[PDB]
Structures are given as structure tokens and as C-alpha cells.
């Protein structure tokens, strides 16, 4: 069981390859697609406000 | 030979989001990508009371990409793949200026900051609509906290500018982003719209320490501004640095080598305590690793495996056989755990000691001086395997005898009973091999206890024999040594 400390010593090499690890995984590019979900979205329409029909003569 | 240099600042970091947009066709209703980019900025600020002037880069990792897409049709609003930045999203911001620590960040034995955390807010975009309701992104926001300094380098077009690399996590705060006027609400996070709020910049301050490695070969006359960077420095020539450590051995001690021999040396007994730099501390034992695998030691170890798992299913006479098995003995002591005083122990302790007073100057090279030593120290060994006290003895260059323990006179050898024996029965290192064991029990006449430990290579015995000053013993011992030499 004294096993363990031993281990530990000899293996914290892994420490900074760890540290490796995670301060160049975060430099490489990764990006999470969020989706846009089965239902589609859309908006009304470009509208414009104006004045109506005007009867003229 | 190299002495340390704290260099530790009160900094402001200033930089700004950079932008970028690209337009899909039609009439002007949909976008194609609203993304992050690098982004570069300059500044002044008085600090100490002289006016330092900084250069900052900020650029993102970790993107998402939202969407919205009104359809197909040739005016409905959207943007094909918006981005966001939230959890997952790290934003680095290269750092420099134009002080004296800066000039001294070549070679660095330490380097860490404190810095305190910021909240990035969202500005209002109105997307470019000709006509109607104008659609309004607003809100969004995130946190900046610090988490590790490391080195890097500005690629800026005049000159490369080594510099100070803050990668700053991410927290995603109140404001929920929302694409209004459209059917994008209580989203959060801080989309790459219009990060920067419309602010001249973003403003960190904190602490940064480091502590530089600036040469010396002299103790009164301590160098600034380091110039002797990787343009300035070359391969330093293999036959140099072998002369160089062949070299170091005029100052080997002979007893205190074997007090050293005879400790445990693992990974972290070794390869700590190495006056080196950030860059060669944080994978020195991987990088030594690398180069042991492939040495011709180590793939010797490879090709005995590999033949003896391929036998297992393909079912001067005697010095060629002896040669032989000396090179497997060689190898079996190299893999296994010898109870003796083990060559390899005496080949780790002069390693140790040789390159515990040499210094990492921006190439590691311990690679190619540890694998190299492994293959090389102590060229011509001896093995050894008692039996009915008629001890076999061989050498890695052929040379073989066979001669009692109670007295050292030898005998006819036996080649094929030799062989039988050395598979299973343990190796025993000669260190003290037959011809100088014969000298000491001629001149010293010696016991049968201590001729028993003696061809044991039992450690307590040898260093009895040792501080005795036996001249026997200490002659032997320091060609041992000598053999050491790459």
C-alpha cells in the first residue's frame, strides 16, 4: 500500500505533460455547432408603413 | 554560470475585439458569417513614472456558431452562422511593451500572473435592412478571468515580438443576448456582433512575475537586454558537448559515486533539480523518453523479445558463443532487477553526476547524453553465476573462466552448462571481475565471508573494502569510472 506515494513520485512527470495537454488543447480551434432545431424559425416579411389608396379626380 | 533575475510588473492590458462580416447576395437582407478575429492594439501608460508603451493582440478559441435563416426566399432575414462566445470560448491576449523585462524574456525560469477579471458587454448592431422594421441585436455578455500566463510572439510586420500570452477563461453573465425585433430572446453569451460596447478598449491591470535566466561567466558583470536569441544560437556540435562531458569526469569522487549509485533513481530523482528553463522543465523527461525508445540499446531490448516470442513457434571457438550471451546478459541486466551492484547503477551515478553541473541554455540535450550514455558507458563488462561454489565468469568481449569461491583458482570452463544456468539462475555483476578479485586475494588474503559478498557484489562488503583504502579495490573501481566517457 505504500505502493502509492512511490507511484506518485515517479509518475508526476504526467503533471506537466498534463499541463501540456490541456494549455495546447485549448489553443487548438474547436467550435461547438449549436444547431438551429428541427423546427425552422422566419420573420413577417420587410414591411413599410404608408398611406393607403387615395381617391383622386 | 547562468543566474536568475526577477523581473516583476504592475501591467494594464488594453485591447478590443476584432470583427468581421462577410455579405450574402440578393438585395441585402441575409449575412453569411459574423465571426471573432484578431485584433491588434497600441497604447501608453505611466507606470513606475516613466510612460511604457504596450502593443496588445486579442484573439478567440472555443467559438460557437449559432444560425438563423429566415428560408430561401430572397429577402426574409437571417444569418447563415452566427457566432457566440460562452462557456467553452477562451480569448488569449498576446501582451508587450516596451520595458526593460521584456527585452530578458528568452530564456525564463519562471512566470505567473495575477490579474483581476473584467465583464465584456455586448453593443447594439442594427443589421443593414433597406426597408421596414429594423431588426436590433443587443445584450450579451461575458466575464474574463485570468487563468495562466505563457509565452508567445506577434507576428507584427516589422518584427516578431516575443511576448506575454494571458489566456483568460470565460464566464457567460446577466444580459441575455437577444436578436430583436426576430425570433432569437434570452439567449446568453456575447456574440461577435459589436463586442466592444462601442469601448476605445477593454481594460485589464494586474501583476506579472518572471524570472529570466541572463548569462554569466562572470560574478560582478551581469548582462541586460538578452540578445542572445534563438537567431543567436546554434546546434552546439555533438563532438563538443561528448568532449565537454568527457571532460567533466577529471572531478568524479570514488566513494561518494558509490553512495550515489546506491540510492533508487526514478523519474522525478533524476530529472528534477535541473536548472532549466519553462520551456525544457515542463517536458524534459517525455523528451529524453523519446530518444531512449529508439536507441540501439533499446531496440536490442525490442529484437531479443521479438526472437524469443518468434522461436516460440518457429518449432577462438567458444569466445563467439560467450560474446553473444555476454550481449544478452547485458540486455537482461538492463530490463530486469539484479539483487548486485549492477553496472547500470554505477553508468546512472556518473550520469547524474555529470549532468547535475550542467545548465539547459534553450536546447534541452539531455537527449542524446542520457540515451547515449545508456549505450555507451562501460563498453566491456563482466557477468558472473555461481554454482557448487564453481563461479562462471564471462566477458561481454569473450573472455571466460570458471573458479572456485573458498579459493580463486580456475578451472576447465563449461560451454552448454554455462548456458543452462545463466537463463535462470541470477546474474551477478562483476564489478570486482576475476582478475582483480585474483590480486586482492593474493596480496590481501581475504575470508570466505567477504570472498562470498565480494562475488555477490554485495554493497556493504565493496564499501567496506573501500574505505579500508584498499588500493585494489579503489584502482578497480576508478577505471570503472573511467570507462564512463560517451
Redesign the interface.
Known amino acids: 500500500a505504500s505502493l502509492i506515494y512511490?507511484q506518485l513520485?515517479?509518475?508526476?512527470?504526467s503533471v506537466?505533460?498534463y499541463?501540456?495537454i490541456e494549455?495546447i488543447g485549448?489553443?487548438?480551434?474547436?467550435?461547438?455547432?449549436?444547431?438551429?432545431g428541427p423546427f425552422?424559425?422566419?420573420?413577417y416579411?420587410?414591411?413599410?408603413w404608408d398611406h393607403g389608396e387615395i381617391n383622386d379626380s | 554560470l547562468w543566474k536568475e533575475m526577477q523581473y516583476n510588473r504592475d501591467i494594464i492590458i488594453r485591447f478590443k475585439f476584432g470583427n468581421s462580416i462577410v455579405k450574402m447576395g440578393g438585395l441585402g437582407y441575409k449575412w453569411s458569417e459574423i465571426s471573432y478575429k484578431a485584433a491588434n492594439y497600441q497604447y501608453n501608460y505611466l507606470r513606475d513614472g516613466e510612460q511604457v508603451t504596450a502593443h496588445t493582440t486579442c484573439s478567440v478559441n472555443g467559438v460557437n456558431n449559432f444560425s438563423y435563416n429566415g428560408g430561401f426566399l430572397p429577402t426574409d432575414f437571417g444569418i447563415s452562422r452566427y457566432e457566440v462566445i460562452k462557456e467553452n470560448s477562451y480569448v488569449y491576449v498576446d501582451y508587450w511593451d516596451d520595458s526593460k523585462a521584456f527585452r530578458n524574456i528568452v530564456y525564463v525560469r519562471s512566470l505567473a500572473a495575477n490579474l483581476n477579471s473584467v465583464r465584456c458587454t455586448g453593443g447594439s448592431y442594427h443589421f443593414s435592412l433597406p426597408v421596414g422594421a429594423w431588426p436590433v441585436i443587443n445584450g450579451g455578455a461575458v466575464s474574463l478571468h485570468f487563468a495562466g500566463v505563457t509565452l508567445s510572439t506577434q507576428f507584427t510586420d516589422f518584427v516578431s515580438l516575443n511576448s506575454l500570452r494571458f489566456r483568460f477563461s470565460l464566464t457567460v453573465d446577466e444580459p441575455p443576448f437577444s436578436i430583436l425585433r426576430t425570433r432569437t430572446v434570452n439567449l446568453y453569451g456575447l456574440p461577435a456582433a459589436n463586442p466592444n460596447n462601442g469601448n476605445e478598449y477593454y481594460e485589464i491591470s494586474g501583476r506579472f512575475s518572471l524570472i529570466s535566466l541572463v548569462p554569466t561567466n562572470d560574478d560582478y558583470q551581469t548582462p541586460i537586454m538578452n540578445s542572445v536569441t534563438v537567431r543567436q544560437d546554434l546546434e552546439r556540435q555533438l563532438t563538443n558537448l561528448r568532449e565537454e562531458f568527457n571532460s567533466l569526469s577529471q572531478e568524479i569522487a570514488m566513494a561518494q559515486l558509490i553512495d550515489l549509485a546506491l540510492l533508487p533513481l526514478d523519474m522525478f530523482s533524476m530529472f528534477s533539480g535541473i536548472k532549466s528553463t519553462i520551456d525544457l522543465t515542463k517536458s524534459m523527461a517525455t523528451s529524453v523518453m523519446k530518444k531512449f525508445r529508439k536507441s540501439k540499446l533499446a531496440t536490442s531490448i525490442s529484437e531479443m523479445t521479438n526472437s524469443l516470442s518468434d522461436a516460440a513457434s518457429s518449432a577462438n571457438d567458444i569466445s563467439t558463443q560467450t560474446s553473444t550471451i555476454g550481449k544478452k546478459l547485458r540486455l537482461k541486466e538492463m530490463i530486469t532487477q539484479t539483487e548486485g551492484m549492477s553496472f547500470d547503477d554505477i553508468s546512472a551515478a556518473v550520469l547524474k553526476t555529470k549532468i547535475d553541473m550542467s545548465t539547459q541554455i534553450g536546447k534541452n540535450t539531455l537527449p542524446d547524453i542520457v540515451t547515449e550514455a545508456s549505450e555507451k558507458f562501460i563498453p566491456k563488462r563482466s557477468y558472473r553465476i555461481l554454482k557448487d561454489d564453481e563461479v562462471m565468469e564471462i566477458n561481454t568481449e569473450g573472455k571466460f573462466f570458471a573458479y572456485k569461491i573458498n579459493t580463486f583458482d580456475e578451472v576447465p570452463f563449461d560451454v552448454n552448462k554455462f548456458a543452462e544456468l545463466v537463463t535462470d539462475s541470477p546474474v551477478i555483476s562483476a564489478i570486482i571481475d576475476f582478475k582483480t578479485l585474483k590480486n586482492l586475494n593474493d596480496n590481501y588474503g581475504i575470508t570466505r565471508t567477504e570472498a562470498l559478498n565480494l562475488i555477490k557484489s554485495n554493497p556493504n562488503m565493496l564499501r567496506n573494502f573501500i574505505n579500508q583504502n584498499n588500493p585494489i579495490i579503489r584502482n578497480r573501481i576508478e577505471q570503472l569510472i573511467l570507462q564512463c566517457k560517451l
Not at chain 1, 9 to 13: A, E, F, I, K, R
Not at chain 1, 27 to 36: A, F, L
Open positions: 512511490r513520485l515517479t509518475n508526476s512527470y506537466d505533460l499541463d501540456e494549455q485549448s489553443g487548438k480551434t474547436q467550435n461547438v455547432t449549436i444547431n438551429p425552422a424559425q422566419t420573420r416579411a420587410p414591411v413599410n
